[PDB]
Amino acid sequence: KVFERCELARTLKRLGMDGYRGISLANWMCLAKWESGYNTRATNYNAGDRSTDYGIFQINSRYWCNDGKTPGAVNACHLSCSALLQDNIADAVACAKRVVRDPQGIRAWVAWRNRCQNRDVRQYVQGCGV
Ligand SMILES: [Cl-]
Ligand SMILES: [Cl-]
Ligand SMILES: [Cl-]
């Protein structure tokens, strides 16, 4: 599914994302916006290293989920990458929380550095009741 902006904001808030390991809701929104356009079903193959990015946060198969087909990979979220293509984003959120328990936190995603870091991201949550 493709979330509407404010629907997603509230959904993430219910799932405990607001301020998780220091990360505001507007940061998570900015990440989802630029990774996927708020789209849970998105996959992107990285021909360079044979990994794939999955779902609304575009979580990568080399480190985070198992797809069977990524050489040398591990699965720190202990999930099938299939779990990250559901309309229900609970598993994706749990896996995003796992990513940001590592030292880089939200910097793990390059798109966040590019599109969100050191910016005014308040627009992402404006009017959403969060
Ligand atoms: Cl911030
Ligand atoms: Cl699974
Ligand atoms: Cl679903």
> What is the C-alpha to C-alpha distance for residues 20 and 82, in angstroms, rounded to an integer?
24
> Relative to the alpha carbon of 118, which ligand is closest?
1
Ligand 1 centroid–CA 64 distance in Å is 24
Cβ burial, residue 70 (10 Å; 0-12/13-18/19+): buried
Experimental determination approach used = X-ray
Task: Determine the straight-line distance between the first and last CA of the chain, rounded to whole angstroms.
Answer: 21
Q: Which CATH class is domain 1-130?
A: mainly alpha
Ligand 1 centroid–CA 110 distance in Å is 16
> Relative to the alpha carbon of 88, which ligand is closest?
3
Ligand 1 centroid–CA 127 distance in Å is 18
- Edge-to-edge, what's the strand order for the sheet holding 43-46? 43-46, 51-54, 59-60
